[PDB]
Every structure is written in C-alpha cells, then in structure tokens.
Amino acid sequence: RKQTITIAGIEVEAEIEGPPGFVTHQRDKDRKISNPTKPYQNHTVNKILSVKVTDKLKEQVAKDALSGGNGYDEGVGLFNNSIFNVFKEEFNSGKELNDILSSLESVARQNSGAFQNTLERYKKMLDSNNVINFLKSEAQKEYPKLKSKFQTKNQEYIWLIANLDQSKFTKIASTSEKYLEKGLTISPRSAFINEAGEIDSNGWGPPDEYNTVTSRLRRDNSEYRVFDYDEYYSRSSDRIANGTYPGWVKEDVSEPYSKKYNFKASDGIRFSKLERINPNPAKGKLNSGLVLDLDVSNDEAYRRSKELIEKLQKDGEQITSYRIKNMGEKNSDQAFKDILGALPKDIQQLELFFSDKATNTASLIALENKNIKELSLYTSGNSLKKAWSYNPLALRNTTWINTIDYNVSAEYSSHDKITTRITFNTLAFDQEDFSNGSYERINDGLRMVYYARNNEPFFQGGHGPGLEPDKKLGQNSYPTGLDFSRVTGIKSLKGLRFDDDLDTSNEPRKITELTLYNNESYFEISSDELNEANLQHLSTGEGNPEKPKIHFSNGNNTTSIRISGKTLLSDEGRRNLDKYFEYNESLRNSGKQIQIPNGSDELKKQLEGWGYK
Amino acid sequence: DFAYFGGTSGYDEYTKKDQKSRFDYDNERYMTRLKSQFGNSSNSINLKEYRGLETKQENIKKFDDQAAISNFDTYYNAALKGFTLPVYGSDGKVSGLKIYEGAEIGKGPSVVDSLGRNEKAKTVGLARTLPNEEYKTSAIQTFQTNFTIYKDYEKEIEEAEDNIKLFDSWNEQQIQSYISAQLTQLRLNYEDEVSQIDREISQTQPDKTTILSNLNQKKSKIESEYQKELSTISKLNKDSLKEWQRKEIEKYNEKKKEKTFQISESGTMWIMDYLDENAGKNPTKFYFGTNSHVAKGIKDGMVSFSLTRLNSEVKVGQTFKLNGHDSNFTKFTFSPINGNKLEDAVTAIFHATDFINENSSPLKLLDSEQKSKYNGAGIFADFAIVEVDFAKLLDKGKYSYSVWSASNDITNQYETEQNKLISKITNNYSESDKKVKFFSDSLLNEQTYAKFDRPLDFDPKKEDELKKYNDLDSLYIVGYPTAYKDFYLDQYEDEKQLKNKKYDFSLWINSEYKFYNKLINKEGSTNSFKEYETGKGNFFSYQIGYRSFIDKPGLTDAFITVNKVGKKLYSLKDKNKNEVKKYFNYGLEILPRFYAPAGGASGSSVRTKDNKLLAVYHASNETARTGLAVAFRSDGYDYKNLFGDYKLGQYDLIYGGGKDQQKEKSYREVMNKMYSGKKSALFQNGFTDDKIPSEFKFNNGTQN
C-alpha cells in the first residue's frame, strides 16, 4: 500500500487499493443462473483513495486548464481554444479598435452556440464585481476610460477575454482542490474562472490507468467480442449495419454458395468472409470467419432460412456469424422460434436486427450449449421505447450480450436510419415458465438479472453501474419493469422474491411498473390479496412525486376488481387492494369493486357481481 | 356510468324501453343543453295549427323542438303550404350514451392504425378502399380569395358603433407587442451605470411605430378589424395581416401567377368497377367511388395525381406506422410529360347532382319565400365516381410514374411490365372473388333496421351470443385523415410526429380506442380480447341532433335536417364552359357510431358484412363524435302530408330506375352512353335497363 503514481507528469504519493472481486455463490452455479463459461468483472483497475496534493502539483493542474495540456482536451483550455484563438488573431491584425465590430459579427452569423458556451467560462470573472481590473494585462490603463466607449455589452466583454493575462491565474478554487485530493484533475474542457480570480470546473478526470469506463470497454472489445479489436471505441452505425470491425476486412463470397444452393442475388440471402488484416498465429482460436446474412423482410429468404440453415449444417460448412435482418419489419407477428431453433447448439455470433414497429422479441433460445461471448440485440429504430422486453431465461447460456455499440444522441438528423443496441428496462416471462403453479423458474430468471449476473452491463438496464458493481450489487441499476402479459395465471407479486437470500450486504429491488394479463372487463382476483407481496412495487423510492404503475393486457378494465371467495381481508389485504385502484389509470377513475354473492360485504362500496356488458 | 339515467335502476328501465320511449328520455335532455342557448328566431306560426304536431302520430317528432334541434325545415302554414329553410347561425352536438366505455369519452372517435378482422382489412381497407389519393394543383389562392371576400362581409356588414368598438377595443395584442418588447430593453438597461446607452435608438421601437399603429386606427372605412392573427400567454403572438380585402385579392391574384408553392386536394376512394373488353382476363380502365367535394380537385392546371394504398400481403391484428412511414403501404405518383394533360387520363364521370329533377318529384318548388335568395340552386348528395385509365398513365411517352414506400423512391426496383404493374397498383382486384356489391334492402323497412339494431348490453357468458354475432355490421376501415389530429401517437414517438401535417396520413377505422397496440398475435401469446369483440363492425349513432327518423337511431333525411354544412352552401363548377351552380345536401343518410376522422377521410365507404357497399361518408363532427354518410339507395319514405307535398324520394344512384329518380342520373345509365354495348365488372350482361338484376328493382319487388 501507500505508493506513488503520476497524474499530471508530476509524481505524487497516493493511497491505492485493488478492486474487490465479484463473489459468486455456489447456489448461483447449481441453479445455472451465474455466467455460463467465465465470471464477468466490471472494475478491472485499481482505486485512488487519497492523493497528497502539493503546491507543485496544483500549479501544474492550473497551467493545464489554461493551455489544454497535451492530452485529449488540448485546444479547449481557457487561453487556448477555438473562440479565444479566433479573437486573438483579429487583435493581432493591423486595424483600429472598432474591428471589435467584426468579432461580434463572428458570434451572430453562424457561431451563436460556440460563443455563449465558451463565454460562460470567463463570465463569472468578466462581470466586473470590483475585481476584473486586476486580471486585465497592460489594458488596465485603457480600461477605465474605454469602458464608456462600447456600443453593446458583448462588444465590451469580448475586449476583456481578448486582453486577460494568463500569468494571473495560478490559483485553484476550494471545491476543485478536494477533487484533486481524490486524485481527479480539472478537465481543461470543463475549466472556468470564478469571481475571486481562481480556476474551478464542472468536470474532473482520472489518469487513464484509473479510468473505469474505458478500461472495461477495452477489455470487452479485445477479448469478449468475436471479431475483436484493440481499441475501446463503440462501432459506428455504418460499421454495425455493414457488419465491419476495426482490423478486419470483409469480402462478399455469395456466388459459389448461390450456385450450390440455387438462390438469386435478389433473394435476400448473402455469404461474406471476414479476415483479420494482421493474422494472429499465437493461438488457433479465430483468424477468418464465414458470415451468413438473411434479410427476412424478403419472402424467399424467410421461406428458405430454415432450409438453408439446415443444408449448411449437414454439409458441415461452419458459420462464425448468423445475421438475421429486419425481423418483424413487414409483418409484426412473424414467428422465429422454428428458425432460431434450427441454428446450431453451439454458435460463435448471433446478430438479430429487430424492427421497432414490431418490438416482437418473443423468440426464445435457452435450451442450447453456447453463444461464444456474443449475442447482439440491435434495431434501426427507437431503442429506448418502454415496450422493449427480454425473457431473462432466454440468455441462460449466452456468455456476453453486446452492450457496447450504443449509438443514441439528440444530435443525429431526424429521418435517417441509425443502428444501436436495445436498452431494456423490462423483464417479460413467457407461458411455458409457469407450468405447474410453481414460481421456481421465474424466481431463477428474476435473480439472474437482479443479482447472479448483475455486475454485467446488460443486466443493469438503461442507467448502468453504481460506485462498485462487483461488490455492492444493490447500488447498481436493474430493469425496473415486470411484464406478465404472456403468462395468464399470475395476478399479483405473490411468490416472487426481490432480494438475494442474503440481506445485510445489499439493497432489495423495487419495481416501477407491473403489466398483468387480463381477459374480461373485470379484474378477477381471489382473496390472495392478504399475501400479495406489498412494498415491493414502490417505484425507485418512497418520497417521489410520480407513483408506480399497474397495467393490463386489454385496457377494458373500467368494470370493477371482482373479489372472489369467502375469506375476509386483513390489514395488508386492505393496503394491496388500494394499489390496484391507485396505480392503474382505468381503475383509478371510479374505484369500483365487485363482491360475488357469498360472505358479508366486509367492504362497503361494491356492486353484487352481475357480469353483464 | 349511470348518472345520465339516474342510477343503475334508471339504466335498467332504459334497457327495457323501445326506441320511441328511449328517444323521449334523451330528447328532453338534449333540448335542455340546447335551450341553455336561445336558438333559431326566424319566421314563426301562431298558437293554432298544431294539427301538424298531431299529424306526427303517423311518424314522430315535436314541432317547437324541431325548430331548434338543428336548422330543420319544420312547417309554414299561412296558406297551409310551404317550407322554411334556415341560415341564422349553427347548432352544436354531443351524445352521452353511444359509449359506456367508462373512462376516455373524448376518444369516442375510432382507433387509427390497427386491423380488427378480415372483413375490415384483407377485405375492405386493404385491396379495395385502396387509395388515399392526392391531386396537386401548383397554386394556393382560390381558398384565400373567397375566404377574404367572406372576411370583407364580416368586416363591413356591421354597425357604426362596432366599427370602432370591435377594432379599437380589441387592440390589446398591439399593447402586448409593446410591453413584451419593452421587457427585453428594461432588462438590457440593468448593467449600464457608465457604458453609453446606444440602446436608446432601439427604444424608437415604441415611438416610430406609435404613429403607424395610430394612423392604422383613424380611417376605419373598410379596414374594420384589428391587424392581428393569434395570441397566447407565450408563443403564437405574431401580428401583421393586411386590410382592404380587394387590394389583398389583387396581391393574391398576382401570387397565383407564380408557380412557386404547391397545394393538394386529398381524400379517399374505393375501387368499385372496371370496363371489361377482354373476357375479364387483364383490365386497364378502373372506376373509383368517392365524394363530390374530393372529385372537384380534378382541375385542368394539375401537376400530379397519386394513389397510396395498403398492400394485399398484410395481416389482420397488426398495427401500422403512419402512411409515409410504413413499408406496408405503397404509393404510385403520376405526372405529365410533353404537354399531355392529367385530365386526359383521370376523369370525374358521375357527380350525383340534381338526380331527382324530373317534374313533380323535386323539393325546391316547396320553399315558401327564401326561393327569392336561393334561386337557381339545386340538390345533390356528396358522392362521385372517378375513372382512371392506367393504359394511358403507364404510357411512358405521355406520363412518368414513380413508386414510393416508407418515403423511399422504389420505382426502378418495383414491378415494370404493364399488366403486372396494373395488378400491383390495384391489389389485383381483377383476379379477386371479393368484388364489391351494393346494399339492396331498404334500411327504412322494420325487418332491415332490426338487423343493425344492437342491444345496449348483453350477457357474454349466456347462450344468446347467437343473435349478437348475427347482427349486421357497419365496416369502415376506409378514409385516411391527415395525421395532424392523430391522438394515438405518443409525445415521444418523435419521427412519426415531426412531419405531422405535411405529406402524412393515418389508416382510420370504426372501433374501440382500446385496441391500439393490443391486438398483436405474438407467438406463444393468448388473445386478450373475446372473439365476439374484435370480430364485428359497429353500428348507428344515438346522436339526437342529426337524426330525422326518431325510432331509428342514426337514420336521417338530409334536406329536412342537414341541407347545408358550415357557413356557405356547396358550389360545383360544371364542364362545357357553363357557370358554377349551388346545391343543397339531399337524400337518405346514415350516422356511423365511432367516426369523426378530422381533416380528410371524406369519400370513405360504409359497408356491411359480405362486402356490400351501404353508404359514403363525407362530413365529420368531432364534438358530436359522429358524422354523415350518403346512402346509395333509398326506398323512399312518406310523411303523410306533414311536410306538405314533400317526400324522402325513392332512388338508386348506382342502378337507376327508382320512382323519383331523373332516369339519366346514376352510374349505370351514365356508363351506358359512354360505353354502349360493352360489359363491366358490376354489369357483366351490359349497362342496358333490361339487365338490372331483379334484386335492385322497386315496388314489383318489395324484398331486396
């Protein structure tokens, strides 16, 4: 312990710790609910607990925020950036002082979002406040007269930034000094000057050996991916659509196969070869791979896909990637269980491109040996729509689901196709997961996501990790929706567990949303409401303005909750009945109850259970 | 739920009542929401003469209610003879009974992108009601010249008091245009304790515009209202409109000479027929049913014509994207080449104008005194039949076609050979067996109406689902309204919702709003709705305002009830260089239950179960939550002299030969003169009068 590390060129003494290992339990192996081939770990690199800050270090961290340093934020520092450099070059021209007019024209024409974005980084100093004159170079003689002689506020305070002296700014602000004691240096892009003539920021970064995000993405792209690459970057939408990878080259080879298996180039079946540009002799695992492309929006490729997938198997030609494109694009009820079930028991890669006008992920691939560290769940539509679900049991013997290749931003054009991995906040169980009145297969599938594989990015849903994903599984995100629309016997959270069997080491999960099957205008329920699991449907937390949701597969539930059986409600029976009226809109509107003709009318608000509409 | 009925015990007696006694309950409630406003005050009859109000014992209404339920014809009795047709404003509509859905009554207009059953699509709104259609004129101004003549009568058919007191009073948006602009300059003046106030020159924004905003007040000779468009708390506060409308019309009539902007007439059609030269083998010349205010978009200045339609390949229970966003639609756009005109290939052939006007059968000779104003004006029903000749639209020497899908151009990858390309355009209506038929039964006879006469409620668990299955249905997966009022789109479905108004449309239906994303038959799922619920159409509306036949919910006679819609009666420009002519709405008409598709979907066929064409939808009222459809056929109706010499009239505007019909004013007898001796898909024995099938005759056949 108690070593030295470098953080700004400067060598510094620091307290350093190794990342806690993911503790797998032997019950996570014997239920086949842990990762099937290799235990994943999220924190690949060490932690900095404290850094001995010194005058020599914090003035180096000051000079980097002014210059940009020599890293990625070079050319966006306080006195070396695109707006500051365009203003200094005009002051360096031979013209008279009123060329300030042309600098203002360079903020009205096209650049109105680069100024009024860089301006803020000076503005807290730039508004005079009885301080600005001490940080104003030789222009301190001109300022007190010339202040009266400006035609617009911007034309004035442009003349402050273009005449500030960099040599005055060797002081760090009180908050940004404490992040430096945690070992995170001011980002030169996030640096601003506050009121007191001192450098502060809205952003701080570790040294790259201590970055948790890029070291994880590097490790995943270099060893979990088939068609691996040495970088940490996600693939572009054009790379994802064309099926191309850094350090690999693609050739179309469809002609021999089209001649063997009798298809036209228009029939929507393709074969392509990938080969690594520098081959790797040192381990025989993969240097080239045959890839099968099936555009199932075509009707020849859909008709023949199962036949072709089997003719390639009995001929013994080996496929490294199957790519199934436009699933559900033409017809949203289009089935795939017969096609996905015809694929080999042992597969290197599977890319599925689902249509978001279908959002039909109902096909299930559990009873296999292996997806060899690749399943890609992709769309060319809206990938963060609340109607995106997976069955958690459908991934049981998939080693890694692709969670990189995330390509969503506000800055894309509308009306072009962009491809990305799906964000899932829903777990959706299917009818074959509830055969004998047993709740066993669901509690396995539920804990798979919520604890047994939770340290992996895919099982975290759309919000990602906490501070320590491998240790404190409770502090991490999870899919907060449950859908039971396919599994008609479930009426409640009865028989469902939301904690790890343990308790003192982890948070218990809370769901925000619950979809239930219903078939009639009445929600029929037994007197199990005494023992529906109660506090487990409570959003993320207790104080929130927005309450959690209940939904039904029909929406016709504007007739009552029909309460059946003779047994009286308890105190938690009352509390559970409230939630179905509160959390479901089309029940909330009138609060209607039905008691079928037995018992006392222990409740005082209901109809006599007619069943007529 | 039951508050309109006085509770569950008061609803039970409404279920047991007949339609006459159901009406008397709803009409004494409709009349009190109505007489909260003081109503029609036109020419009136004295305390005698309620012998007409007793002549209603043969067919039932009430005379002083009828004078206000809407602009109805009532009575005029100074010589026991005449009609009064009203114009002194308009009257609103709702009905808190056709629904019972128990939550979202404001969604009583249909679902929008979803298919319930095969008789709705894979039969009706797919393959047959094929085209959402567009006609593009390369202009804008003919709406605005007439709307500014209307705005000029609004300006100056006005009292000298309001010539000030509607303009100089309602000037508060100019005051807001100052105090908002001032609040920018007020805040900009905060940090200028030493710095020179160059900004005082921009504070001429009050002063140099005060003289202009006061000279625009003083004259008020014809500029009789404020120059201002709209206002809100924040957005949409723009004010700039001009005044003196004949100078604004002089600007419009020169903007009309620049080919800069383009506008569309757009509506809906169904395929009804084709001319049969070649023993049915490979047809090229097709006839489409639509409505007359849509078919008048066929003008000589037209730059393009298009057909966008749901492809036959599609499956029931699916929910679509918008029409420009789903690849299950295809669009075919046609444009002229070498100075060929688009009317040389696309023609309005029948217009249903003045189709009663043989002697003694009309109604215009029955108007009391307002025939002084409504001189020369005729009668019509809003229905028209358009011919499209694809053998001279796919002729590459005269026109260029383009094929589109999901807003891609797909022309060079689509079908190319003409007989296959006409089959891919027309969803192969030639080689289909489910060709259209027309509803031959009288909807006014009691045994016909009883086939559509729904129970308000039933026991779904009991054995009498039989007799609820066996109801006749109204089907209307027809019409494509513009997507602007499509409320089923989520606030965060941005790409569908972005180009909301321009180029984009919905596949509107006649069904529960509850179906929207819920009918999807995913593998391993169970159906969430009972087979009786999705497996039907819907019915007639219990709206009081539009109804004429009181014991028949949703049946009306248009001239006694709905003779005019909006501000102005309907004009159609006649061919052969004749003048425009004005027409009142006339004929037997229907009120569909769940159908107020705003901003389009005029021309939408109402059908029944076995693909029988029943009525044509043309007007919407999204406050009534219903709208109006032209019946093709009428058995007539007799009022026992209640309305003087007036009668509903017996007619068929597809087959002709009805007792009051002009004998030259139906689809068959129009097509007989154009194509004498040839066959048709509806007329396989030819267009001659002896080849009407005996189902469509009248009086000698009383069952149809």
Side-chain angles (χ1 to χ4, degrees), chain B residues 354-463:
Chain B
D354 216 20
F355 66 86
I356 298 303
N357 205 0
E358 180 168 43
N359 310 97
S360 79
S361 295
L363 62 79
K364 284 295 315 302
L365 68 103
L366 312 177
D367 284 305
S368 293
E369 177 270 0
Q370 72 286 351
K371 65 177 298 190
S372 57
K373 186 175 178 181
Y374 305 111
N375 186 40
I379 58 98
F380 89 119
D382 198 21
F383 168 60
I385 309 174
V386 172
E387 179 185 85
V388 184
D389 189 346
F390 294 111
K392 62 169 160 173
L393 287 178
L394 307 174
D395 186 357
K396 292 181 182 179
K398 299 177 188 155
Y399 306 85
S400 40
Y401 76 88
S402 54
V403 190
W404 304 73
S405 186
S407 193
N408 305 273
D409 181 357
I410 76 163
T411 305
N412 298 116
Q413 65 173 77
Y414 210 71
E415 187 57 271
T416 188
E417 184 271 302
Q418 184 172 245
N419 290 187
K420 288 192 294 289
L421 185 54
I422 292 170
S423 301
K424 291 291 291 186
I425 288 162
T426 65
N427 275 316
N428 205 4
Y429 183 68
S430 182
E431 300 313 302
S432 182
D433 279 11
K434 292 199 177 181
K435 293 191 176 69
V436 308
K437 290 165 289 182
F438 286 87
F439 190 82
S440 58
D441 306 345
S442 175
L443 254 182
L444 292 156
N445 300 174
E446 197 58 27
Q447 82 287 1
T448 310
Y449 189 79
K451 296 189 287 176
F452 299 88
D453 186 9
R454 74 184 183 97
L456 306 175
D457 53 12
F458 79 119
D459 188 348
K461 317 181 309 306
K462 204 54 46 59
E463 186 59 13

Side-chain angles (χ1 to χ4, degrees), chain B residues 60-70 72-87 89-123:
Chain B
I60 290 276
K61 298 194 170 187
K62 201 167 184 177
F63 270 17
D64 184 60
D65 296 355
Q66 200 204 114
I69 290 163
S70 293
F72 290 41
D73 276 35
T74 63
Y75 45 76
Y76 184 79
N77 301 66
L80 312 180
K81 183 185 184 78
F83 279 167
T84 301
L85 175 137
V87 73
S90 298
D91 313 289
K93 311 283 193 289
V94 198
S95 169
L97 187 144
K98 70 177 173 282
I99 309 180
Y100 312 114
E101 293 307 329
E104 300 198 294
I105 282 157
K107 305 179 186 177
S110 172
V111 74
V112 70
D113 298 314
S114 189
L115 306 179
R117 72 161 182 180
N118 200 288
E119 316 314 321
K120 302 180 90 87
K122 200 71 174 192
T123 308

Side-chain angles (χ1 to χ4, degrees), chain A residues 78-93 97 99-109 111-112 114-120 122 126 154-164:
Chain A
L78 278 160
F79 308 126
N80 181 21
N81 67 69
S82 185
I83 285 292
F84 187 93
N85 298 358
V86 167
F87 294 172
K88 89 188 297 186
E89 187 272 348
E90 190 77 334
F91 275 72
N92 288 0
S93 78
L97 190 141
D99 73 13
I100 281 285
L101 184 148
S102 300
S103 281
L104 185 80
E105 190 159 38
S106 82
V107 316
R109 278 181 297 165
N111 316 313
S112 59
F115 189 84
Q116 209 75 64
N117 186 342
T118 53
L119 172 60
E120 278 62 18
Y122 317 91
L126 223 62
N154 283 331
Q155 292 190 71
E156 163 58 345
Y157 85 144
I158 285 172
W159 188 85
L160 279 309
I161 61 185
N163 292 277
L164 249 67

Side-chain angles (χ1 to χ4, degrees), chain A residues 38-73:
Chain A
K38 169 174 172 175
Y40 189 95
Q41 172 157 335
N42 210 308
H43 284 350
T44 52
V45 296
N46 309 80
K47 193 73 169 187
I48 298 154
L49 298 194
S50 287
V51 176
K52 184 64 183 182
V53 68
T54 62
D55 308 21
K56 234 73 73 178
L57 175 66
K58 70 190 186 191
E59 300 320 320
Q60 174 73 333
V61 170
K63 285 174 181 289
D64 279 350
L66 303 185
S67 59
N70 65 30
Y72 190 80
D73 293 326

Side-chain angles (χ1 to χ4, degrees), chain A residues 147-151 153 329-337 355 357-360 362-363 382 414-415 430-431 486 488 517-520 552-556 558 585 589 592 610-613, chain B residues 1 12 100-104 191-192 194-196 198-199 313-315 318-319 321 326-328 407 457-461 492 495 498 512 514 518 520-524 526-530 533:
Chain A
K147 173 64 200 298
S148 68
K149 312 304 291 280
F150 285 110
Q151 289 67 46
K153 291 299 91 181
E329 189 262 295
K330 177 173 279 166
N331 286 168
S332 309
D333 65 321
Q334 178 182 185
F336 293 99
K337 291 188 179 181
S355 194
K357 52 184 296 196
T359 186
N360 189 356
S363 297
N382 178 359
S414 189
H415 206 30
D430 208 350
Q431 186 56 88
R486 300 174 188 157
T488 67
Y517 180 75
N518 201 24
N519 198 347
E520 290 96 19
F552 296 106
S553 304
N554 61 339
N556 293 57
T558 62
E585 183 280 330
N589 290 350
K592 292 184 299 192
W610 190 21
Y612 205 104
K613 207 80 179 180
Chain B
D1 304 11
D12 274 344
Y100 312 114
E101 293 307 329
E104 300 198 294
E191 302 284 28
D192 292 324
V194 174
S195 308
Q196 75 190 21
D198 193 20
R199 204 176 306 102
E313 296 89 285
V314 166
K315 294 176 185 167
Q318 186 173 0
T319 293
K321 302 90 174 180
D326 206 304
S327 52
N328 295 284
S407 193
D457 53 12
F458 79 119
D459 188 348
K461 317 181 309 306
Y492 304 102
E495 296 181 45
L498 180 64
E512 309 181 12
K514 293 175 180 168
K518 304 293 190 172
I520 316 299
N521 50 274
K522 297 187 175 186
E523 58 267 57
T526 305
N527 299 97
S528 198
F529 304 93
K530 299 296 190 188
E533 207 148 52

Side-chain angles (χ1 to χ4, degrees), chain A residues 485-554:
Chain A
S485 303
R486 300 174 188 157
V487 50
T488 67
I490 303 172
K491 286 173 288 288
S492 59
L493 271 56
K494 189 193 89 77
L496 302 186
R497 298 185 289 269
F498 296 82
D499 59 359
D500 49 339
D501 299 337
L502 297 70
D503 44 17
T504 52
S505 55
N506 272 316
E507 168 178 311
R509 309 316 186 173
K510 298 295 182 82
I511 71 175
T512 66
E513 190 161 54
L514 177 67
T515 310
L516 295 173
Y517 180 75
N518 201 24
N519 198 347
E520 290 96 19
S521 64
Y522 55 90
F523 175 60
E524 199 279 337
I525 187 158
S526 189
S527 208
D528 78 325
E529 299 198 281
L530 293 80
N531 62 270
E532 168 172 33
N534 53 358
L535 303 170
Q536 286 157 236
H537 190 2
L538 200 88
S539 196
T540 192
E542 72 182 344
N544 276 23
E546 82 304 327
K547 301 301 174 279
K549 288 188 179 183
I550 297 168
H551 287 278
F552 296 106
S553 304
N554 61 339

Side-chain angles (χ1 to χ4, degrees), chain A residues 533-604:
Chain A
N534 53 358
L535 303 170
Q536 286 157 236
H537 190 2
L538 200 88
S539 196
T540 192
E542 72 182 344
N544 276 23
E546 82 304 327
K547 301 301 174 279
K549 288 188 179 183
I550 297 168
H551 287 278
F552 296 106
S553 304
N554 61 339
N556 293 57
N557 314 284
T558 62
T559 295
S560 315
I561 297 182
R562 171 181 294 188
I563 298 177
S564 66
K566 302 180 185 80
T567 308
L568 299 87
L569 303 176
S570 67
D571 185 27
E572 292 308 311
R574 300 287 195 144
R575 298 305 184 249
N576 282 329
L577 181 60
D578 298 353
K579 308 322 182 70
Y580 290 98
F581 290 118
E582 189 183 349
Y583 302 164
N584 182 86
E585 183 280 330
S586 322
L587 284 172
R588 200 192 304 132
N589 290 350
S590 57
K592 292 184 299 192
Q593 295 169 38
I594 270 165
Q595 182 159 344
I596 78 174
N598 64 31
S600 310
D601 297 307
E602 304 74 18
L603 297 157
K604 298 173 287 185

